[PDB]
């Protein structure tokens, strides 16, 4: 199985709304315009976790106290455990969305979750196709605006 291609943001919003406990993982490979969208996600009914360098952006935006922090491989370890209590002690996350991942690392985490965590559905919502997600955006990086538009479709529906 390769990740089903997602071509619109509305379907992604719908899955976020239906999940019991959605988690948005935000890594360091975020353009300035991507980070404008991510600020807006922080205000939605979704748990946000920043990995590595991404945490600095949230701090400088004054959103430090509105997001979680993790080291990516450690967070992946916790996610794999079906019995992990999550950041708030109230459970694991049934829907995990990934953006801004260093591609190679994001790919390995997605493979780990696919192989070992059937309890999680994983969506890659980045500007590169991630075959290892359950679902992924395509290779949109040549025309970043197309990608921003998809993120805007998610946001408008949330």
Query: Determined by which method?
Result: X-ray
Cα–Cα dist 76/84, whole Å: 11
Top CATH class, 1-158: alpha beta
Query: In the sheet where 95-99 sits, what is the strand order?
Result: 4-5, 135-136, 121-124, 95-99, 22-26, 47-51, 68-70
Resolution of this structure in Å: 1.8
**In what helix (H) or strand (E) does residue 5 lie, and over which residues does it extend?**
strand 4-5
Q: How many residues does the chain have?
A: 158
Residue 42 contacts residue 63 (beta carbons within 8 Å) = yes
Would the CA dihedral through 127, 33, 109, 3 be positive or negative? Answer: negative
Burial of 132 (0-12, 13-18, 19+ CB in 10 A): buried
Q: Which residues contact 49 (CB under 8 A, 6 or more apart)?
A: 23, 24, 25, 26, 67, 68, 69, 70, 75, 87
Domain limits, the chain:
1-158
């Amino acid at each position: 199985k390769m990740a089903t291609l997602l071509e619109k943001g509305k379907p992604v919003a719908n899955m976020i709304k239906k999940a019991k406990r959605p988690l948005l993982i935000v890594g360091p490979d975020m353009t300035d315009e991507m980070f404008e969208r991510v600020k807006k996600f922080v205000e939605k009914d979704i748990t946000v976790v920043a990995t590595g360098s991404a945490i600095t952006r949230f701090i400088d935006a004054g959103l430090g106290e509105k997001v979680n922090y993790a080291v990516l491989h450690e967070l992946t370890q916790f996610l794999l455990d079906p019995d992990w209590k999550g950041f708030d002690g109230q459970g694991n996350y049934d829907l995990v969305l990934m953006l801004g991942s260093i591609y190679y690392h994001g790919s390995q985490m997605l493979a780990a979750i696919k192989n070992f965590a059937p309890h999680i559905r994983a969506l890659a919502i980045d500007r590169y196709y991630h075959p290892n997600a359950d679902m992924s955006f395509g290779n949109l990086w040549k025309k970043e605006e197309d990608y921003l538009k998809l993120l805007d479709e998610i946001l408008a529906e949330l």
